[PDB]
Amino acid sequence: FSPXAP
Amino acid sequence: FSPXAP
Amino acid sequence: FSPXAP
Amino acid sequence: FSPXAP
Amino acid sequence: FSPXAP
Amino acid sequence: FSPXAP
Amino acid sequence: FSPXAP
Amino acid sequence: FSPXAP
Amino acid sequence: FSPXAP
Amino acid sequence: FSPXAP
Amino acid sequence: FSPXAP
Amino acid sequence: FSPXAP
Amino acid sequence: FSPXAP
Amino acid sequence: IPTYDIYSRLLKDRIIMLGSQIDDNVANSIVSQLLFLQAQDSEKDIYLYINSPGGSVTAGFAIYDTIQHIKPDVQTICIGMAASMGSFLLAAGAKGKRFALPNAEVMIHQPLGGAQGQATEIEIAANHILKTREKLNRILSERTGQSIEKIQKDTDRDNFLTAEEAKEYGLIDEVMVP
Amino acid sequence: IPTVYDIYSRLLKDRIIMLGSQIDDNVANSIVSQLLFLQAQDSEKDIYLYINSPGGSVTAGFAIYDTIQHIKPDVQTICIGMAASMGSFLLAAGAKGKRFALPNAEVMIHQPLGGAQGQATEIEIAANHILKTREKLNRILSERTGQSIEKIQKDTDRDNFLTAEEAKEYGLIDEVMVP
Amino acid sequence: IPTVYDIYSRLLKDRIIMLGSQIDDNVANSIVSQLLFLQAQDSEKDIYLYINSPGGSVTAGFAIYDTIQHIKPDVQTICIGMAASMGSFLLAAGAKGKRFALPNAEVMIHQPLGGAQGQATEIEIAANHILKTREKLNRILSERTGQSIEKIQKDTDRDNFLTAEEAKEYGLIDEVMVP
Amino acid sequence: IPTYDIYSRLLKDRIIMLGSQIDDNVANSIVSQLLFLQAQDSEKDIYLYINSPGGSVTAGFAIYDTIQHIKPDVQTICIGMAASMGSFLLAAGAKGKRFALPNAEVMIHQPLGGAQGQATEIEIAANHILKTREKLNRILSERTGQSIEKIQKDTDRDNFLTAEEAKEYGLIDEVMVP
Amino acid sequence: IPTVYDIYSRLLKDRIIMLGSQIDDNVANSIVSQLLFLQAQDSEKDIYLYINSPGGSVTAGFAIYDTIQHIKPDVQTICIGMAASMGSFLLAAGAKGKRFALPNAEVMIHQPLGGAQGQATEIEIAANHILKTREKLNRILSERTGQSIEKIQKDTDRDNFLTAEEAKEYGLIDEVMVP
Amino acid sequence: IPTVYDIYSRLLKDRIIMLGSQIDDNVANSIVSQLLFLQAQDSEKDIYLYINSPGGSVTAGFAIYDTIQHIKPDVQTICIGMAASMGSFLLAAGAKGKRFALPNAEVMIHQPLGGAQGQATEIEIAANHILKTREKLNRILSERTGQSIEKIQKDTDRDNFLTAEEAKEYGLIDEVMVPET
Amino acid sequence: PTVDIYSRLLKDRIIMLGSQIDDNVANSIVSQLLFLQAQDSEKDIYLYINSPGGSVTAGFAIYDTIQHIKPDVQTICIGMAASMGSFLLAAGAKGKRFALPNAEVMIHQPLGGAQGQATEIEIAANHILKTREKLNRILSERTGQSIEKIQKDTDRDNFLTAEEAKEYGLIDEVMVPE
Amino acid sequence: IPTVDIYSRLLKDRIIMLGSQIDDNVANSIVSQLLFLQAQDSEKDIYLYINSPGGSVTAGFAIYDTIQHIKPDVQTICIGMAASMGSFLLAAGAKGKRFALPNAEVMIHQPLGGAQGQATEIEIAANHILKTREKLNRILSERTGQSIEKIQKDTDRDNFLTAEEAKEYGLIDEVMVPE
Amino acid sequence: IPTVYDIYSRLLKDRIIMLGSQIDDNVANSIVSQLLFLQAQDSEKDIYLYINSPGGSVTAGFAIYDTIQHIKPDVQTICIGMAASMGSFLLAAGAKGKRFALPNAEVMIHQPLGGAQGQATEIEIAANHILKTREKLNRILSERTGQSIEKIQKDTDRDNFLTAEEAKEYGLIDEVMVP
Amino acid sequence: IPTVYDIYSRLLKDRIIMLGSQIDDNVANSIVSQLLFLQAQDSEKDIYLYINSPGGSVTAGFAIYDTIQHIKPDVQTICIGMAASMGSFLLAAGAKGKRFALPNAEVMIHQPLGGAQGQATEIEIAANHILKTREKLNRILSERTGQSIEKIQKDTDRDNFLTAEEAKEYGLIDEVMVP
Amino acid sequence: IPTVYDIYSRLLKDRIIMLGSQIDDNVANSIVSQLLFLQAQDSEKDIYLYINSPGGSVTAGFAIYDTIQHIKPDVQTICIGMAASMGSFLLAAGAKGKRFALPNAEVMIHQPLGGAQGQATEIEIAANHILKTREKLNRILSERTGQSIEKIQKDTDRDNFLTAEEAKEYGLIDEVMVPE
């Protein structure tokens, strides 16, 4: 799940 | 059940 | 239950 | 059952 | 069962 | 249970 | 069972 | 069981 | 199963 | 099982 | 879990 | 189991 | 478990 | 349940209650009650009240044959439900004297059974059950006035009738009205 | 269930015995006692055995059978609903000329059923016992129906269902009881 | 079933006791009680024990056996249907000359059955007990039948089914009751 | 089974049947029959007929204490089997009046039980069953004339006795001969 | 089982009540009813409560307890066999000077038993309630035996088996009924 | 068990009805029938409802409830051992001034219990039914105890165990029956 | 055991029928037969058979695959070939059907079951008698016995020694140890 | 299931999946995964993805204490469901780095358990679970910024929250919106 | 369990086959395939059949037996722990002079065990099959041990346990493998 | 579950052993084997036993205990989540100065649990044995904690739950592992 | 469970066999195979058998026993945790001077357990068999410990729990293995 996680 | 049975 | 039944 | 038994 | 028992 | 019931 | 009990 | 109860 | 399938 | 199968 | 185990 | 089997 | 087994 | 027990009091008025599934115990009791009533008075009517989902065919025939054997007329009245062998006994009552209450349900269908084992054993059970069906259908035909062809079609699957429909069909003679 | 004396006890006053279940030891001892009781009350008057039974224990059925044959009174047998296996054997055991069935009654004859588990030797013993049982039954059935032992053997190899009219033709009953 | 005096209580009034089931502690206590009651009513008239039973508990069977031998009246035994195991032992326990079977009755003799579970010593104890139990049964059967112990031992090693006629030749009964 | 039922009929002759496993229901019934008979007649012997594999220790002791408490002598007669608590009861009948039939079985052993949970719980259960056994063994010693040390040894595992051996042991006084 | 009236009904005529099973609500409703019935027949004569019980429901026991204390007649308690848990509570509840046990009767005291499953809050409620129940049992026991609450707490922490003599010593009963 | 007429039949002659179990339809049909029979024998003399019950069916409890209030005679209520849930509701329902408990008797009150399975709509109908049932119970308990509906609601949120004395303080009963001597 | 052992025999064209015949077994045996044809369509296949039988349709899956592929499929009964097992033994290329000397062959009629309406039982009975007819027709052709004789000989469980199965025509040779 | 093993592939990216009930197995694995990631790189963030109905409290605390012990920030992301100990662990994420997808469900409630036996054992169990709740509420307070009193009341019964409600409560820092 | 290949697969390379369980179809198939494999690898070297087995299916056991006798390699048999029933049959099936038991091994011989359920006719067929089966076994065992069929029939009537030494005297093995 | 070597095998390369379940014979066989393996690889470097266990079999636990004391390397112990019963015993068994618990870990000590059925003598043997087992546990705990055996006896009488800080004060661990 | 090879296979490489379960046919077949494998690998080097077992099947246990005695290597036995019934019998079967237990390990000796149901004759057979089995176990134990047969008989009559030091005194092991 990026951005931001990662 | 009478009349008629009995 | 009387009155009224019976 | 009569006649005949009994 | 007679005769003989009883 | 008397007295009082009955 | 007699004699002796009873 | 008597004597004493009853 | 050939011939024919395959 | 040879001879004969195979 | 280091430091210290290991 | 040797000797002798094998 | 050595020494001695092994 | 309530109090002689209610059912024993009704038997003294020549009413027999068939209010359960039909097995050998039930048949044995109904057969005995039919024999007893006939032995007390061989000319007064007997009244068979039916609320039953049916059951054992041979048990049901024990009752059927007893009804036909005895001198008294046996009136049949369906209250609630007469299904399967239950509906066959309803039709078994004396001509002119088969009734149902208005909201009673009648259901007809083919016999149910089972078989397991060797092919030959399955064949035997199949020969047997088909023969049982032919016998019931032949008797039902005679009682209802319906053709065998039409009974065979109508019992192929579960077939639910209202009382008024059961009258039209000939399983009973009248719908008992208030 | 219903009373009048309950209904069976009232029929027992008419010398009617009802055999309306599977035949086990309990049923047999009751039937036997009823037969003995009736013979003691009057050893001349007929007893009527009414049969609606899928059969059951062979040894229980034989307790009944030998009791019927032992007592002075003639035992009539009437098949209502069904008489299968030991139930049909008992139907055939009624006094000659006094064996009946209702028109829609099923009669079924077949060979004895059983079972065995264990050692080869124990299976053998069981097998020998059931085969002797079958011969005993067949021999008696032959004598009662007038059929040969060979015909009975063949006809009871598998479940063989008969109408009331076929059982009469076979020799198992004397008469179909018409309305 | 019938009345319902039930039929068994009615028969009891004629000094007839029914052993028509498996022998367990309840059945034995009942048969024992019946025997004692009949002796108290009259200590000279015969008692008649009718046997249709697959047998059962040995100690229960012995409660009955010892009661039979203790009381003054002769106890006739009559096998109807089946007397197996402790049932055939009790058949053979009837007063000498008054032991009977019906023509189609089955008699079966065999060794006692049991179990044992636990430590080697416990199994040993259970083993010794059932072996001593078998020796008691055999010694009494020997005396009742006229057969040797060795013969009883060998003929009970496995289930041994006798006809009425074979039981008579064996000495387990005195007569086949002919109709 | 047969009909006054046969056990009620025997109870009128002061005979009590202990013909099953001993649990609280049985013991409550035997205790009551004992108290009843003593109140009917405080002098005439009672007869306890025993055919039991034993059962609950506290149930058996309810019976045992009642026997000793009441005025009448309680004769005991072993028919079939008397094992465990059943043999302890047999042995408890009035002196000179404890009998077995010739083929009756007597078995003596130690009490049995069970315990689960914490170490402290197991210990409590163990102490309790050990005290129960010493109590039983002491009474049997007094009733048989055997030392405690012999009873301890002879009940360590299941120990079967003939009637004649029970007599020699001191558990009964006589073998009832025909 | 036996008839004399069944035996228990016969003893109830002598004002004897038998608490011979586990204490549940049916048993309590029966014992309560018997107590009220005896008082109504005669409010001066002693009643006799015979106890052979492993205990059971505390609320059910308390229905018995409160009925005993409410009625006028003295209720004697007699332990035969076993009085455990709520069983021993009721034993101790009999009229002072009229609490007995037979010599070999076993008396057991311990803390109440229960369960709780669900939310922490539910568990807390269940725990508070069972702790209050124990405090109520302990207070009454102190008063009936003359032992301090502190000693009852400690001695009931685990299953504590007493001889009849020890029960007497403890003050749970007044006399051992020696023969 | 014992015959004295069985013991309950004997007490029924003294106008004593025993509610000594879980409350289901059979129990209610029986107590209702007893109450109607007693009123028919005599419409003036008090009846006495002895209660030892962990509760049960609300609707069965309400058959007993309405019957009590319908008949002319006062129904006294005596709690022995325990009255929980619908049991305590019936305890509180006795004729005012004639509701008792024995001293070590327990009383317990709490909310109704039920279940629901199926579609969301089904769950909603059952939730609304049970919450309406709880309002109906609480409104009657308010009137009988004298406590507010607000306070009954809070105090039945979880299982709430009362001693006899607390039940009296609460208004569930009128008197703790104490032992004479 | 490795290295797999059955996969190594499959490289030598050896297929093991060493279980109850169900659909998974059939699928596997079929795939193996087809695969072996694909690798080499002239060389013989060896089907080794230790099997109590099973599903008739699954057995026919295997039968039709044997008959359809170009290579001869030898059959060797080891231990037991019963019911559909014995059928498949009999289905091997003529002259190449063996049994080991102590192996067991059993032939019998097919087994099945049916419950429900008389019409459903008729259908199951018809289907199973047709299956038996098909099986007996094929066995007649494979063994050279008449259909009437196969019907008679399969009415009940019929156990044959290796030597008897040769005489009957179910196999060609008893494979004796050199 | 699929290859590209997908979860091991994601672990190469420092993503840990908490996608089931929390029991001792799941904890041992999550704890191990955390320590392993820290050994590889003690500065790169870890990402804990949570779809869990909760489970064991002690198991949940093994994961919790490991998250707080390691140097890396552990981000949490609630996908689907975080209930009970699931929501506790969601809240244990590095501050500023706790997220939920918009349609995720967060539920909080009190610990569940059970107790059986003596009054004293129930007490101990009650005390233990009440202590556990206090420990849970104290830590949840500090993570959310809510008071212990509020946490206590809000968890008295099952309390379901939308992602947005979880953010307002302080259990997460952001609802993760789509591009 | 352990990896040395697995341990059995490692022993297979030295031409050792383990018959270490109950004999059913799966086991027979495995052993048979193993024997065939080893023969094809080398048709002259010995195969060693290690036996610790309570027995099992007769026909499975004959699949193994016929395969042993078919192949060119001598199959040595070694009893470790136990060889009972078809396991002892297989022990005796090894190449004469090369059948061993370890000193504390147990060998047991007995009759075959089976079952049968249904019509007298089906039971007869079952009985006949199992008796034929027993004759087959006994005949083969005779030839192998040098004991007569009459003696084998007597000695297998009941379970008959032999020590290794007794099995050697009997002829079921050639040598006690001594340490 | 994850790979990344499975995770635990990867940790075993760093001399970490995971006791993350109930203690039974299989678990003890693995832990013992791991400890022995590690010591064979390096007889001087520390081993790290991480513990999240509710306890289990005392004899299993002692297999692990004795191995720990036997081998040369220091075994550090780290309680994550829970160490109860035999789990806490082993936590306490770690090298002096190297026994740790994480801040929210739970330690529980209690007496051993067991069972006994059978004859009085058998119960007594089982009682003696579990009492000896307890005294052995308590004595070791005393030596490891610094508490008197009497204090251990009292504090293990029932389930006794300690926080990590309390376990440290008690002497079961040396340090709470702070973040 | 863990990989290093699985851990047991890795110890087998150092001649260590782990008996950590109930003794049944499968465990005995595995241990037998392991023992045979180790003797093939090196006929002279010591084998180490670690025992943590409540016992089990007597025949299964004698498969292991007789394998131990047949092979050339000395088999050291080391009790960790518990060695009960057949487990203690095997402990006692290790090469003399090389039977050990750890200090807190328990050893338990008792008589064989079994079961029979059926005819009196079948019960007799089962009993003779279990008594003979006992006699065989006691005689061997007599020879391994130096205790008389009569003493073994008495001491195995009930469950008899020994500490490691008691089992050394009894002659079931040679040494208690103490820590450094």
d(CA T9, CA V36): 9
User: For residue Q15, what are the CA distances in angstroms to N31, Q55, Q79, U117?
Assistant: 46, 21, 13, 45
User: For residue T73, what are the CA distances in angstroms to T45, T46, T78, V40?
Assistant: 5, 6, 16, 20
| The 3-state secondary structure of W112-146, one letter per residue | CEEEEEEEHHHHHHHHHHHHHHHHHHHHHHHHHHC
CA nearest to N170, candidates N154, N146, N147? N146
- Amino acid identity for residue T145 in this structure: Q
The catalytic residues of X are 85, 110
For O178, other C-beta atoms within 10 Å of its C-beta total: 9
Total residue count of chain C as it appears in this document: 6
User: For residue R65, what are the CA distances in angstroms to R89, R97, R143, U14?
Assistant: 9, 17, 14, 68
The two structure tokens encoding residue Q100: 């077995």
Provide DSSP, Q2-51: ----HHHHHHHTTEEEE-S-B-HHHHHHHHHHHHHHHHH-SSS-EEEEEE
Kind of pairing between the strands at R106-109 and R75-84 = parallel
Q: Hunting for tokens 């091994």 — which residue is that?
A: V105
d(CA R167, CA R108): 9
Residues in chain O within 8 Å Cβ distance of E1 = 36, 70
Owning domain of residue O86: 1-179
- CB contact under 8 Å between R122 and S14, yes or no, is no
CA nearest to X64, candidates X82, X80, X83, X45? X83
User: Which of the 8 DSSP states describes residue E1?
Assistant: -
The answer to whether chain A touches chain I by having 3 or more C-beta pairs less than 8 angstroms apart is no
P78 in E contact zone (CB under 8 Å): yes
Exposed e or buried b for every residue in R31-48, given b needs 16+ CB within 10 A? bbbbbbbbbeeeeeebbb
Burial of R128 (0-12, 13-18, 19+ CB in 10 A): middle
Give ∠ CA O156-O162-O167 in degrees, rounded to 5.
95
The catalytic residues of T are 83, 108
Enclosing H/E stretch for X114? strand X113-119
d(CA R179, CA R168): 16
d(CA N36, CA O2): 12
Enclosing H/E stretch for Q160? strand Q159-161
- Helix %, strand %, coil % of chain A (to 5): 0, 0, 100
- Per the CB < 8 A criterion, the answer to whether V123 and O114 are in contact is yes
Instruction: Kindly report each contact of residues T118-123 with a partner whose C-beta sits within 8 Å and lies 24 or more positions away, as own/partner.
Output: T118/N110, T118/N111, T118/N112, T118/N113, T118/N129, T118/N130, T118/N132, T118/N133, T119/N110, T119/N156, T121/N113, T121/N114, T121/N115, T121/N122, T121/N125, T121/N126, T121/N129, T122/N126, T122/N130
| The 3-state secondary structure of T54-113, one letter per residue | ECHHHHHHHHHHHHHCCCCEEEEEEEEEECHHHHHHHCCCCCCEEECCCCEEEECCCEEE
d(CA O144, CA O167): 12
Provide DSSP, chain N: -----HHHHHHHTTEEEE-S-B-HHHHHHHHHHHHHHHHH-SSS-EEEEEEE--B-HHHHHHHHHHHHHSSS-EEEEEEEEEETHHHHHHHHSPTT-EEE-TT-EEEE---EEEEEEEHHHHHHHHHHHHHHHHHHHHHHHHHH---HHHHHHHTSS-EEEEHHHHHHHTS-SEE---
E6 in P contact zone (CB under 8 Å): yes
d(CA R24, CA R59): 9
User: Cα X4 to chain center, whole Å?
Assistant: 28
- Per the CB < 8 A criterion, the answer to whether R117 and U125 are in contact is no
Question: In Å, how far is M3's CA from the nearest CA of chain W?
Answer: 10
Burial of O92 (0-12, 13-18, 19+ CB in 10 A): buried
Kindly identify which residue of chain L lies nearest to residue X69, measuring between CA atoms: L1
Which residues are CB-contacts of X19 (< 8 A; sequence separation ≥ 6)? X27, X31, X49, X50, X51, X52, X53, X64, X87, X90
Instruction: Choose the catalytic residue: W70, W110, W142, W148.
Output: W110
d(CA X48, CA X68): 11
K1 in U contact zone (CB under 8 Å): yes
Exposed e or buried b for every residue in Q141-161, given b needs 16+ CB within 10 A? bebbebeeeebbebbbbbbbb
D4 in N contact zone (CB under 8 Å): no
Q: What φ, ψ does residue V167 adopt, rounded to 5°?
A: -70, -40
Q: What φ, ψ does residue Q31 adopt, rounded to 5°?
A: -55, -45
Helices vs. strands in chain T: H and E counts, helices first: 7, 8
- Amino acid identity for residue U70 in this structure: I
- Amino acid identity for residue W98 in this structure: K
Q: O68 - beta bridge partners?
A: none
DSSP three-state, residue R131 = helix
Question: In Å, how far is W156's CA from the nearest CA of chain U?
Answer: 13
Return the number of CB contacts < 8 Å for C and S. Answer: 3
- Per the CB < 8 A criterion, the answer to whether R72 and R39 are in contact is yes
What subunits make at least 3 CB pairs under 8 angstroms with P? Answer: E, G, O, Q, X
d(CA S56, CA U165): 39
Nearest-10 crossing angle of helices O25-41, O58-70: 10
Question: Q interface mutation test: which of P36, P39, P133, P138 has the most Q CBs within 10 A?
Answer: P36
The two structure tokens encoding residue S20: 């000594």
G2 in P contact zone (CB under 8 Å): yes
M3 in W contact zone (CB under 8 Å): no
- Amino acid identity for residue N51 in this structure: N
Enclosing H/E stretch for O47? strand O47-53
Enclosing H/E stretch for W59? helix W58-70
CATH number of the domain bearing residue W61:
3.90.226.10
Category of N96 on φ-ψ map: left (φ > 0), alpha (ψ -120 to 50) or beta: left
DSSP three-state, residue X170 = helix
User: For residue T30, what are the CA distances in angstroms to T7, T134, X6?
Assistant: 15, 21, 38
The catalytic residues of R are 85, 110
Category of W114 on φ-ψ map: left (φ > 0), alpha (ψ -120 to 50) or beta: beta
- CB contact under 8 Å between X34 and V177, yes or no, is no
- Amino acid identity for residue W65 in this structure: Y
For T4, other C-beta atoms within 10 Å of its C-beta total: 8
Question: In Å, how far is N169's CA from the nearest CA of chain D?
Answer: 32
Question: In Å, how far is E2's CA from the nearest CA of chain P?
Answer: 10
CA nearest to T46, candidates T22, T17, T26? T17
L3 in V contact zone (CB under 8 Å): no
- Per the CB < 8 A criterion, the answer to whether X94 and X35 are in contact is no
Residues in chain H within 8 Å Cβ distance of R48 = 1, 5-6
DSSP three-state, residue X73 = coil
In angstroms, what is the resolution?
2.3
CA nearest to S96, candidates S68, S75, S78, S81? S75
Which residues are CB-contacts of N36 (< 8 A; sequence separation ≥ 6)? O4, O7, O10, O11
The two structure tokens encoding residue X18: 């782990």
| The 3-state secondary structure of P146-170, one letter per residue | CCCHHHHHHHCCCCEEEEHHHHHHH
Which residues are CB-contacts of Q118 (< 8 A; sequence separation ≥ 6)? W110, W111, W112, W113
> Considering its fold, how many domains does chain V have in total?
1
